[PDB]
Amino acid sequence: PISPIETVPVKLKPGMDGPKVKQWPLTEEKIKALVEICTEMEKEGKISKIGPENPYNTPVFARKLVDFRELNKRTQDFWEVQLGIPHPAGLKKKKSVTVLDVGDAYFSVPLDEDFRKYTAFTIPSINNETPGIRYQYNVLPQGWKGSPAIFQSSMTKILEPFRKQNPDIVIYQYMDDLYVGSDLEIGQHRTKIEELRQHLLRWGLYTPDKKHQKEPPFLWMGYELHPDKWTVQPIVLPEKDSWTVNDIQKLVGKLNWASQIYPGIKVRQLCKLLRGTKALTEVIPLTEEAELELAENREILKEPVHGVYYDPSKDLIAEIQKQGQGQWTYQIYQEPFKNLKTGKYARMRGAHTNDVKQLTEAVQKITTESIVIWGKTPKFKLPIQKETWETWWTEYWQATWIPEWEFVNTPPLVKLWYQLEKEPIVGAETFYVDAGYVTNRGRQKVVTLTDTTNQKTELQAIYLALQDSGLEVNIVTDSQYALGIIQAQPDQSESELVNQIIEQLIKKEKVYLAWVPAH
Amino acid sequence: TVPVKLKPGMDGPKVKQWPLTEEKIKALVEICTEMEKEGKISKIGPENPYNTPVFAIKKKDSTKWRKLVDFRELNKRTQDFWIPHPAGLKKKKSVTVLDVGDAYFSVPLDEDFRKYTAFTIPSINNETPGIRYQYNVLPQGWKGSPAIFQSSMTKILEPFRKQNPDIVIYQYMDDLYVGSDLEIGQHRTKIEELRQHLLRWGLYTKEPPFLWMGYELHPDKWTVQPIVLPEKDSWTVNDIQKLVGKLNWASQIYPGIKVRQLCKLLRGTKALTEVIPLTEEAELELAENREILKEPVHGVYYDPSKDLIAEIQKQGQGQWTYQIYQEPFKNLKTGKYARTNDVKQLTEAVQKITTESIVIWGKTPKFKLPIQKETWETWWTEYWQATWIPEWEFVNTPPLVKLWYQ
Ligand SMILES: CCN1c2cc([N+](=O)[O-])ccc2N(C)C(=O)c2cccnc21
Structure with missing residues (x-):
């Protein structure tokens, strides 16, 4: 394990110890396959033959798949490998950008020597009389908890210098992909691109060459990316006469995706279809409004639109x-x-x-x-x-x-x-609400509704009072509840009551609402 | 270094960082690069899962920026340290605040504790990992810091202390509260001298930045707001209700308040604007209630x-x-x-x-x-x-x- 990369010290969750899980012997076809691979790896230094002095062991099987799940359960939490994902509009325009797949990805970074013993695994020996070969990773094992974050880490330090030598250039590391763009005459670009590969290669990191690289635009994380413009990966709105709750939700989902770039998408009508549904596989016929909306969205989506950069x-x-x-x-x-x-x-x-x-x-x-x-x-x-x-x-x-x-x-x-009077209206009837009301002009009405909350009863009373009053009205109540709501002056609400009330309010010339402690 | 540990069983914080403005970001960068240079902090790796939020705020009357770390969570998980707040300070005429935080940059931090001081500098639109460091010295804002430095602090202050003991000096976190009774002029004076005594006795091992526009707080004049009742000329039904309401509420606090009389004045279904004449009876009830509110309710202790x-x-x-x-x-x-x-x-x-x-x-x-x-x-x-x-x-x-209220 000879490398220029400083290793990140790793330790297992406190108290916990290394994984000592059994190896499920394999056919001789499987055994050979491993040995061959394991030997190549030994040759490359990625793993190293160790003695039966190592009490640890993770299972392995057949290409090689090492299951580190358990170890992963015993390994310390590292820092969040990349928190949020950058959004396309937050980028700067580029004369050109090239993408590099990072080969030898994890299988190219040294592992905290102190921690290697825990990566120990064993390949059974064909002969049963004989014991098996015990190795241990010397690098970031594919599939291990640290691997990502650690690599991510390493990678940037590797980049660190180069970056400064090329302030003009811009690099973004994203998984096993390296994105790089500049505003250099094309060839100069490709050139720098080459320098890069070599620089990396200078720490054992291999990467694809010009003819193998993917080319713009670039579909990443669901978008379509050009060096100077962006957009959402294409949305095809299926055509059929039988939509299932499921179908619907997806479409609505897809529809939203668009909204960030496509202005005017509307889901109100489709969404409505999902009410009272009973199974994902229940078929809801489209309403007239739904059809209209979908159709409309069909048209918007039909023409490609594209976002610009920052x-x-x-x-x-x-x-x-x-x-x-x-x-x-x-x-x-x-x-x-x-x-x-x-x-x-x-x-x-x-x-x-x-x-x-x-x-x-x-x-x-x-x-x-x-x-x-x-x-x-x-x-x-x-x-x-x-x-x-x-x-x-x-x-x-x-x-x-x-x-x-x-x-x-x-x-x-x-x-x-509307807007409540800040002062009680003179010459306007005064209603006292508590299930009904009583006004200073002798009038009253007491209704008893079936199925209602105490809070809801309060609002209704007030409602009544609004209905039966003239254009100017004073209203006295003991519901701090109802008061706060109205005082807030809503113009829309989930409850119909409030809306009716709101409707009344909007009509009135003036309305004074007041509170008084009850009883 | 002095070994410090979290309260038993607790682990370090792993708080998430709030997005910042390019501007604020750039600030912290400059700042931290320097701090790094001077070995105050050092970049950390992924082997560190902890994180405290960090912000950039401005120093009023200054061109410079200031880093502010949100050690609130940390401080809560930081073992207690098993000077009693001076009753005199509140009583003084004038108090000025100093930012003696930089003094902490001197004392080393128990290596075993540093990892927990992990904080990060965000990157716009998550286009880059984001700079991560941890402290090596006592960090500003950490509960521990003032404690640990207490030592050197009492010392460096001893002289001036007894030199002119007419002044009260109180330290809270990175703050130093200086109280006196001196004339506004003599104050600002002896104030500047401390600044100097401080520099001139190097805890900065720059003179102590003032806090609060250098301005002074006059705790002497900190008076409590008594509850108040309208002093209406003529009282309308409405006024009265609003009065009774308020009173009812306050009755919770002051049990001697009574509204029986005022409530009578509100017989039946009168009209809000109808003006009601206070009756001798009620007139003396309000008056009493009014006298009761004149001061804070007795028996309230800290x-x-x-x-x-x-x-x-x-x-x-x-x-x-x-x-x-x-x-x-x-x-x-x-x-x-x-x-x-x-x-x-x-x-x-x-x-x-x-x-x-x-x-x-x-x-x-x-x-x-x-x-x-x-x-x-x-x-x-x-x-x-x-x-x-x-x-x-x-x-x-x-x-x-x-x-x-009001
Ligand atoms: C120059 C890098 N690049 C780019 C950046 C990025 N980031 O910062 O998170 C993510 C993706 C990405 N890709 C793939 C691009 O093609 C791109 C396009 C235009 C400008 N910069 C682009």
């Missing part, structure tokens, strides 16, 4: 639109509508809400993801006026902040359909 | 054995209300904060509040923040400037409790 020079701009109740879309471009990316947001945070609250939340998610991709926040272009925003702002008991943003007059404009 | 809590409330307009108690309804303090944007405000308030908690009880409280996590997480580092990090939680206050 130019750290120019700014990031994000534009938002409400494409439906609790449904929003957005797009990030730097150069006018030259999208880097697009996307939707249907996140209903809380049982009740309003566009202002949501739109605000949308912004956040965007902000979060922008940072995660371009390390910066985009200036926003929103369909809401500052005045509207600020109004809601101050009112809300919760804190919140929206980075720099400009109003965009692109209907529909988000607004507040 | 139990060092319990966590200090702190909830803040938004009153809109840039004003905020907050309370510190260890038991429901049994506040030890209450105040307010006025104006920027919501977050900025909030973080300022939190820090302000924490800073007091520290000055009063030499301990940080556990805040209850009225905001959405993702939002906080996103911007707090943008205005944060303290060197410690309080423990927080996220809540959705009921617009009822807000109406009962």
Whole structure:
């Protein structure tokens, strides 16, 4: 095991000891096959013949498959091998990029000598009178817990120097693949490409040559990648007259994949089909709306669209639109509508809400993801006026902040359909709600509904009071519950009640709602 | 090095790192490269599974950036160290804060403990593994650091201490609280001298950066906000209800409060705007209730054995209300904060509040923040400037409790 690579010291989970699992003898066909391989490996230094002084052993079988599962169960946790995956729009444009498959992958990195003994395995001897050969890996065993992370690690240090000597160049390590692009006249590129291979090769690392490499575009992690443009790997929307819950979910799934680049995809209608379904194999006939939606999506998908890459020079701009109740879309471009990316947001945070609250939340998610991709926040272009925003702002008991943003007059404009009077209305009837109401003008109505929550009863009362009152109305209640909800001023809710109420509210000229402790 | 161990049985933290802005990232890079150079920290390998979050914050009145590691989790799993907070400090006229964190960079860290100080510098869009290091010296923000350095610290301070014992010097984490009663001018003076005494006696082995715009806190003037009732000219049904409500609530705290009389004034189904004449009877009940609130409820004491809590409330307009108690309804303090944007405000308030908690009880409280996590997480580092990090939680206050403050 002669190598220029400093090894990462490994140790087994505390208390735990090496794996002492039995070897299930093999036919002589299998035995020979191993020996031959094991010997080649010995020759290469990857493993080394050891004595029966090693009390450890992992099973092996037949190519060679060493099962390290157990060891893996006894080996320390390493640091998360690559956390999140980079998104295509977060990249910079390249005159060219080449991909290198890393051969001799793990089978090319030294293993902490101190830890090798644990990798010990034995190949039975044909003759039964005789004992078998005991080896132990000298390198990162394929299939072992550390292998990945450790290799990943090593790899980058190997790259470390070269990188500095070629600041222009850019390399990204991803598994057993090495991605490299530059803005060098083509050949210069290929040239550097060669230097690279050699440099690696200088630490026993082999790689494929020009004619063997795959070439752009590059389908990776589900996308299609060119040095200067990107997109989602092609989506074919099956054609059939029998959709199964299963079929549906998949399609919807696929449909979403698109949304990040394809603007206007809508799943509302398809999704709806899944209600009350009883089996993955249950067949739901498409509704008229479903057909329409699918068809429409068929058309969008039909024409290939493609995302552009990041130019750290120019700014990031994000534009938002409400494409439906609790449904929003957005797009990030730097150069006018030259999208880097697009996307939707249907996140209903809380049982009740309003566009202002949501739109605000949308912004956040965007902000979060922008940072995660371009390390910066985009200036926003929103369909809401500052005045509207600020109004809601101050009112809300919760804190919140929206980075720099400009109003965009692109209907529909988000607004507040109503607003409670800050002071009780003079000359307006006053309803006292507790299952009914009693007003100062002598009126009353007491309804008793079947099947209802205490909280739901409260809302209904109020509801009644709204119905039976004139355009201006004062309402007194003892439900902190109902109060908070309304005070929040929702314009959409899961509960129909609230919606009915909301409907009433929107109509009224003025509405004062108040609380008073009960009993 | 002094051997230190986690509390029995606990393991090191493996917290996840929050995405950062290219800008903030670059900062930490520069910083760490230097720290590395000087052997303070060193890159670590994958054989290290631990990780604490790290942030970049700005030094106000400075061009330089500051690294802030979130040792909160670590500190919790860090064995206790089996100076009692000075009751005098809170009482002093003026207190200034110094950032004596760099002093820690001198003492070595028990090698066996370093691995746990693992933290990482994120990489944009996960396009690269991300720089990982661990500390070799005592790290700023770690519970252990001030303890271990306590020694050298008491020493280096002994002279000045007895030189002019008219001043109270308190250390909390990387913070040094200096209290005096001197004239604002003489203060800032003797203050600068300590800075120098510190440099001039090298714990920096640069003069001690001030914290809080160098500005001073006047704990002397920290007064509690009593509950208040509207002083209406004419009382409308509505006003009264709102009055009774508030009172009912406060009755929880002050048992002597009574509304029987005020509640009578609200007979039947009257109309909200109808103005009701206070009756001699009720008039003296309010008055009494009013007198009862004039001061904090008796019998509320600080139990060092319990966590200090702190909830803040938004009153809109840039004003905020907050309370510190260890038991429901049994506040030890209450105040307010006025104006920027919501977050900025909030973080300022939190820090302000924490800073007091520290000055009063030499301990940080556990805040209850009225905001959405993702939002906080996103911007707090943008205005944060303290060197410690309080423990927080996220809540959705009921617009009822807000109406009962300010
Ligand atoms: C230059 C590297 N490269 C690229 C980078 C990357 N990353 O950083 O995680 C992932 C994939 C990837 N691939 C495969 C590319 O083809 C590519 C295209 C354009 C620019 N850089 C591209």
